[PDB]
Design a protein around this ligand. Structure first.
Ligand SMILES: [Mg+2]
Ligand SMILES: [Mg+2]
Ligand SMILES: [Mg+2]
Ligand SMILES: [Mg+2]
Ligand SMILES: [Mg+2]
Ligand SMILES: [Mg+2]
Ligand SMILES: [Mg+2]
Ligand SMILES: [Mg+2]
Ligand SMILES: [Mg+2]
Lengths: 53, 125, 109, 128, 240, 225, 63
RNA sequence: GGCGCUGGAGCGUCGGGCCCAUACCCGGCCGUCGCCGGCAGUCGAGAGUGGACGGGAGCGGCGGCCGGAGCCCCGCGGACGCUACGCCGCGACGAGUAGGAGGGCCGCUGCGGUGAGCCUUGAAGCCUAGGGCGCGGGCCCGGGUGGAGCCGCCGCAGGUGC
């Protein structure tokens, strides 16, 4: 699975396939890590904050 | 993978209902509508679901095809059965058992089809 | 026709000096004043019969004011012929010093 | 008449009364909600005889009959019709309460759908 | 096949036979009875009839269920006892023998003295304090709710009719066929009717019970009177 | 292959049934032999005393080698040495009983905890009643009731003890594997003495209940369980 | 009353990883099954090491 | 301790009965701890404390002394389960200030997501001899009042519980 990369068809503006294919980028086989995503989201949502006192 | 996606969505899902010391799952293909790895209707490579027909007569048995796993527009095949109750249950039994298409959901699908038909028959006085 | 039940007195609950076990009651049967005479009454049904304000259904009869708390003699108590009784609900404390009927029902003679 | 549960065991409650807070009878400022006494001399905390009883785990209900209503069903709260079809396969052991804030015209539809699905509603005549 | 034999191992206490394993081996002659070595059609074929319907139909019996409930109950474990009530062994108190005068403690015949005839198949006693004496017909009673007195009449070699059984004395009910919602009163038939058969049976039994009652002095007055507890008398000191 | 596998399963089941039958016969005959041994000992003591009295001498019986020890006082306010010796005797609760093999070391241990225990010399009937009514084994650190002989066999079979009768024999006649057989048994959890005690705070010889009563421990046991 | 001491009743040990790493949890499931259904003590050791913390799983140098 | 008690309800020595503690024994239920216990076998055909082959030479029961391959099918069928952070089994245990730790589908306010959530056919708040749930913190539902907003779930953050 991780080493296997299918071909995704590119769809035209009319909704149907255009006959062109792109090999699946390897980033879509990266480890799905919800705990790391939650940690990064938690710590970066604090950076747009505005002080109150 | 099914187990990986289950570890992702076992507690974080928009189909998850946690109320009154009970838990439920409302994804489309969930027989028994319970939050469980066996009955989840999204994470498995093959799934079966039973719904009421568009008009209130018959059932729609939907099965997940093998090929288009990432293609949700063509990943499910829906067939409508509008026979008598015994024939409908026999058809569902044959679809699950003869095909060996998830034989662990056979009685769940049969019971759900029975519930749907019993709901569809006219009320009494 | 006749009385058909032995008279008893609700003497009190099973108790220590400063603790009271209301689930079981002590009955003083009239004429039974030794422990060895109590063997007849063991297991017999007993009834606390009283009256109230509202009518209640009477089995095999018309509704009336009579109400019953049923029970039975369980064992002997003391040397002087006390008996212990278990009732379906614990006897009210207003019944202390009042009549209990021992009904002879589960006869062994 | 009413829909019956799958099984109706004998529900045994170890305690039927409520655990009232110590000295909640003597003050209006003290609500009856249970609070653990932590005074140094507190006789209720020390468990003297004839006092207010303190809740503990020994009063816990049987796990088989925990959360059962007197009818034998177990309660689930629903807000619209869509949340009612989760009980379709839990029919014989779970009943539905329509939430208090659901409007009358919507709870009519919920009641009728539950009647179709043979689901029990504990408040089926609640806004009419 | 061979004719069944009796046990050949007499019981001396329940669960223990009189003869040992080897003794029973020799009594059975197991030394010469030594052995070494040597259905239901669910579907029926039926002629369907009609041209070109094929030959016949393989019609199965016990078709599969049309409906399945949403959930069921697991089956029970096995109990290796707990026989039904019709197979219980019936126990009778040693003080109750046929002809004994009993005292009814419950029912509308409370306190009356009746004559015991026989224990029925359900363990209920069949009694008759003859109807000409105290208005107690051939009637069932429970041995737990009677007092067995010491006075007896020899009712041996009297003929209790064979049809007098539990099914004979069982209560009969009418309601409620062809009637579900009660808008019109269904209190009819509440008058229980004494059957001519019952009257004939009562006459037949009493005709041979009464002469044995009259044979002993003032027993009939005893049977006419009812039992009561005087204030001075106590049942634990009373000899019955 | 269906007929072959049927034959294989039938042969295996029949071999297992034959093994069970042989083991049951062995248990039966061991119990018979133990009965013979018990009556031989009981008659031997009487016969020895009789010949001594005939000769005009005195026959002193062997000092009893088995004791039953029952803890009669509670767990409040116990000196550390008494508490330690009670833990070593496995008497951590009031009205707990344990079989103790008697020698100098164990006798001195009993003397230390004398005010807290009542002990004596059980007889064959007392041993039988204790093992049969209240016998529990310490199998995998769990208190398991001795409802089958397999429970004894799986824990003590390596010592030749395979049944309730073997356990009772090893306890009564203090055998080679008495330590293993006794530690296999969970300490007996006996009820309160029906009919009450005399005085739990004094010695038996002074009207109480503590200490060594020689063979009245059997009277105590009958009421105790 | 029973004369025992309760301060050592609860054994302090890792029964599961404190981490929420789903891949680690999946292979913990795998070795839980293997340790249960095999007689290999290697699987037991590996499972209990998978439970362990990072300081109890020090890095191993190539040398 | 009081009333009282003197052929004792006093003193000394003793007997038999009987009374009851949250103690002991049996049973039920709750929780904790232990077995780092069992379950991925949903395996109605799985069948396992060895099976395979593969020729040696032999018996034992049926196929006149030569003799042998079996595959489920008159039924096409067969409960539940396994949120594995789940479910199940067995055993022992349960006092607690100061203090420590865990769990909280206990509660408050706000934020990111989510509930094709709720709501003028009536939100919040409040009142209630109304119905219930939970050991409990608390919560849900009915009725009334009210008249415009509010809540569940997954995370996040506190000026968060008298
Ligand atoms: Mg409550
Ligand atoms: Mg208050
Ligand atoms: Mg203090
Ligand atoms: Mg002390
Ligand atoms: Mg007693
Ligand atoms: Mg402690
Ligand atoms: Mg305890
Ligand atoms: Mg504690
Ligand atoms: Mg503050």
């Amino acid at each position: 699975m991780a080493c296997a990369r299918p071909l995704i068809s590119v769809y035209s503006e009319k909704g149907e396939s255009s006959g062109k294919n792109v090999t699946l980028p390897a980033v879509f086989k990266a480890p799905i890590r919800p705990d790391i995503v939650n940690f990064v989201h938690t710590n970066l949502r604090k950076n747009n904050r505005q002080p109150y006192a | 993978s099914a187990h990986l996606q289950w570890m992702v969505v076992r507690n974080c899902s928009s189909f998850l209902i946690k109320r009154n010391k009970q838990t439920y799952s409302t994804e489309p293909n969930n027989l028994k509508a319970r939050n469980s790895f066996r009955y989840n209707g999204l994470i498995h490579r093959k799934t079966v679901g039973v719904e009421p027909a568009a008009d209130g007569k018959g059932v729609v048995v939907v099965i997940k095809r093998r090929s288009g796993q990432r293609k949700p527009a063509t990943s499910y095949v829906r067939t409508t059965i509008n026979k008598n109750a015994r024939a409908t249950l026999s058809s569902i039994r044959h679809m699950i058992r003869k095909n060996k298409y998830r034989p662990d959901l056979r009685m769940a699908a049969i019971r759900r089809a029975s519930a749907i038909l019993r709901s569809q028959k006219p009320v009494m006085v | 026709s006749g009385r058909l039940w032995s008279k008893a007195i609700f003497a009190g609950y099973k108790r220590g000096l400063r603790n009271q076990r209301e689930h079981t009651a002590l009955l003083k049967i009239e004429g039974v004043y030794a422990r060895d005479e109590t063997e007849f009454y063991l297991g017999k049904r007993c009834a606390y019969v009283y009256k109230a304000k509202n009518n209640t259904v009477t089995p095999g009869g018309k509704p009336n004011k009579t109400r019953v708390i049923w029970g039975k003699v369980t064992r002997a108590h003391g040397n002087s012929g006390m008996v212990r009784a278990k009732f379906r609900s614990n006897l009210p404390a207003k019944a202390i010093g009042h009549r209990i009927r021992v009904m002879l029902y589960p006869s062994r003679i | 008449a009413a829909l019956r549960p799958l099984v109706k065991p004998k529900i045994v409650k170890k305690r039927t009364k409520k655990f009232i807070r110590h000295q909640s009878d003597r003050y209006v400022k003290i609500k009856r909600n249970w609070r653990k006494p932590r005074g140094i001399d507190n006789r209720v905390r020390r468990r003297f005889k004839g006092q207010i009883l303190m809740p503990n785990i020994g009063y816990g209900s049987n796990k088989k009959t925990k959360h059962m209503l007197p009818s034998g069903f177990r309660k689930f709260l629903v807000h619209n019709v869509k949340e009612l079809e989760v009980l379709l396969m839990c029919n014989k052991s779970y009943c539905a309460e329509i939430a208090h804030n659901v409007s009358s015209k919507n709870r009519k539809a919920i009641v009728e759908r539950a009647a179709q699905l043979a689901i029990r509603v504990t408040n089926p005549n609640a806004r009419l | 096949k061979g004719k069944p034999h009796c046990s050949r191992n007499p019981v001396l206490v329940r669960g223990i036979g009189r003869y040992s394993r080897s003794a029973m081996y020799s009594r059975k002659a197991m030394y010469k009875r030594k052995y070494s070595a040597a259905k239901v059609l669910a579907t029926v074929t039926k002629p369907v009839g009609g041209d070109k319907n094929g030959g016949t139909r393989v019609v199965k019996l016990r078709k599969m269920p049309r409906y399945y409930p949403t959930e069921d109950v697991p089956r029970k474990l096995l109990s290796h006892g707990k026989k039904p009530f019709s197979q219980h062994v019936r126990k009778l108190r040693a003080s109750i023998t046929p002809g004994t005068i009993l005292i009814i403690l419950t029912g509308r015949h409370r306190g009356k003295r009746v004559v015991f005839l026989k224990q029925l198949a359900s363990g209920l006693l069949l009694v008759t304090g003859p109807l000409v004496l105290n208005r107690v017909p051939l009637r069932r009673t429970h041995q737990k709710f009677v007092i067995a007195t010491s006075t007896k009449i020899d009712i041996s070699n009297v003929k209790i009719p064979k049809h007098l059984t539990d099914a004979y004395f069982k209560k009969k009910k009418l309601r409620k066929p062809r009637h579900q919602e009660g808008e019109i009163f269904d209190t009819e038939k509440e008058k229980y009717e004494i059957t001519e058969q019952r009257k004939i049976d009562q006459k037949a039994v009493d005709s041979q019970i009464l002469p044995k009652i009259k044979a002993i002095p003032q027993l009939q007055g005893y049977l006419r009177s009812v039992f009561a507890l005087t204030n001075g008398i106590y049942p634990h000191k009373l000899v019955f | 292959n269906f007929a072959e596998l049927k034959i294989k399963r039938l042969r295996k089941k029949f071999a297992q049934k034959m093994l069970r039958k042989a083991r049951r016969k062995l248990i039966y005959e061991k119990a018979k032999h133990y009965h013979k041994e018990y009556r031989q000992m009981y008659r031997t003591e009487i016969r020895m005393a009789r010949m001594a009295r005939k000769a005009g001498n005195f026959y002193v019986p062997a000092e009893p080698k088995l004791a039953f020890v029952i803890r009669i006082r509670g767990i409040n306010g116990v000196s550390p040495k008494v508490r330690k010796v009670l833990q070593l005797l496995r008497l951590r609760q009031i009205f707990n009983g344990t079989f103790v093999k008697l020698n100098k070391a164990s006798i001195n241990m009993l003397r230390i905890v004398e005010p807290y225990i009542a002990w004596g010399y059980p007889n064959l009937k007392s041993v039988n009643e204790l093992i049969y009514k209240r016998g529990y084994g310490k199998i995998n650190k769990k208190r398991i009731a001795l409802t089958d002989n397999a429970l004894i066999a799986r824990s003590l079979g390596k010592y030749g003890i395979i049944c309730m009768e073997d356990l009772i024999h090893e306890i009564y006649t203090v055998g080679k594997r008495f330590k293993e057989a006794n530690n296999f048994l969970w300490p007996f959890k006996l009820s309160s003495p029906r009919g009450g005690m005399k005085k739990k705070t004094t010695h038996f010889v002074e009207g109480g209940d503590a200490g060594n009563r020689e063979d009245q421990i059997n009277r105590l046991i009958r009421r105790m369980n | 009353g029973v004369d025992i001491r309760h301060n050592k009743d609860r054994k302090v040990r890792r029964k599961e990883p404190k981490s929420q790493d789903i891949y680690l949890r999946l292979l913990v499931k795998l070795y839980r099954f293997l340790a249960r259904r095999t007689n290999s003590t290697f699987n037991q050791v590996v499972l209990k090491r998978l439970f362990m913390s990072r300081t109890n799983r020090p890095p191993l140098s190539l040398s």
